[PDB]
Amino acid sequence: PGPPGPPGPKGDQGEKGPPGPPGPPG
Amino acid sequence: PGPPGPPGPKGDQGEKGPPGPPGPPG
Amino acid sequence: PPGPPGPPGPKGDQGEKGPPGPPGP
Secondary structure, eight states, X not given: XXXXXXXXXXXXXXXXXXXXXXXXXX | OOOXXXXXXXXXXXXXXXXXXXXXXX | OOOOXXXXXXXXXXXXXXXXXXXXX
């Protein structure tokens, strides 16, 4: 049997992060 | 007849999220 | 014969939470 193939391509980038914390009070 | 290679590397972390909500009115 | 390339890797983690919002009005 032949050797295993090489590692595959890199995966997709993750989804964008959630909105940040609320700003400071007025 | 080699098997498929190991899975590719994990993708990049997603981009930082957008700015948060405005702070409370003062 | 060597095997073919593996399939695409796992998706990346979600990005970090965003920066703080603007000061209030």
